[PDB]
């Protein structure tokens, strides 16, 4: 299956005898699921995201059937606003990004040129918007609140901003604010023709 990014890349998973929908998220190292009944021993853990950190219960060796393919790995269960399948499981079902082809054994980073500055950013299929750490961008901008794993953040919204992603030009809305990592979301990914394959 090859999926485009005009809509959130949602997939049906079966975990612990239960059926759920989850997001194929190349920007997440870990798999994080909403509170659910899982059998076995676990360990408390803390994970960071936009908005901050959340405490999760970690389970190892959990079998998950993602879109009909089986995979075994670590799954985090916690207060996520969405069920996220991270790179730990994505590599197992052979998922790749194509825009070049990129496997997910390492974070999918690219160099972008924006506002005359060079930065590295993460190709993030789980993000609807593009969010960059604080930087010098010209023009008028509007305050906006975006939520994420740790909660929400106020960002400045700039529209019609030119970005050159891995040598591809794209124009769109760019959010500037307190992100821990520069994220290139679906609003720009669909412009450089990014597809997900598994």
From Swiss-Prot:
Which positions fall inside the Peptidase A2 domain? 20-188
In this chain's numbering, which residues are marked as the site (Cleavage)? 1, 99-100, 198
The catalytic site is made up of 25, 124
Where is the region Dimerization of protease? 1-104, 49-154, 88-198
The protein's role, per its UniProt record = Aspartyl protease that mediates proteolytic cleavages of Gag and Gag-Pol polyproteins during or shortly after the release of the virion from the plasma membrane. Cleavages take place as an ordered, step-wise cascade to yield mature proteins. This process is called maturation. Displays maximal activity during the budding process just prior to particle release from the cell. Also cleaves Nef and Vif, probably concomitantly with viral structural proteins on maturation of virus particles. Hydrolyzes host EIF4GI and PABP1 in order to shut off the capped cellular mRNA translation.
Q: What is annotated about its quaternary structure and interactions?
A: Homodimer, whose active site consists of two apposed aspartic acid residues.
Q: What is this protein called?
A: Protease
Q: Which organism is it from?
A: Human immunodeficiency virus type 1 group M subtype B (isolate HXB2) (HIV-1)
- First-to-last residue of the parent protein present: 489 to 587 of 1435
């Amino acid at each position: 299956p090859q999926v485009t990014l005009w809509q959130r890349p949602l997939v049906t998973i079966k975990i612990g005898g239960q059926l759920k929908e989850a997001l194929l998220d190349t920007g997440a190292d870990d798999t994080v699921l909403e509170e659910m009944s899982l059998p076995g021993r676990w360990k408390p853990k803390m994970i960071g995201g936009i908005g901050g950190f959340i405490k999760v219960r970690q389970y190892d060796q959990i079998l998950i059937e993602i879109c009909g393919h089986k995979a075994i790995g670590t799954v985090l269960v916690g207060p996520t606003p969405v069920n996220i399948i991270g790179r730990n499981l994505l590599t197992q079902i052979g998922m790749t990004l194509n825009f070049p082809q990129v496997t997910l054994w390492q974070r999918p980073l690219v160099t972008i040129k924006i506002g005359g500055q060079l930065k590295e950013a993460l190709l993030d299929t789980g993000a609807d918007d593009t969010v960059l750490e604080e930087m010098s961008l010209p023009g008028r901008w509007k305050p906006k609140m975006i939520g994420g794993i740790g909660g929400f953040i106020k960002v400045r919204q700039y529209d019609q901003i030119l970005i050159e992603i891995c040598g591809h030009k794209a124009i769109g809305t760019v959010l500037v604010g307190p992100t821990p990592v520069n994220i290139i979301g679906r609003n720009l990914l669909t412009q450089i023709g990014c597809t997900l394959n598994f």
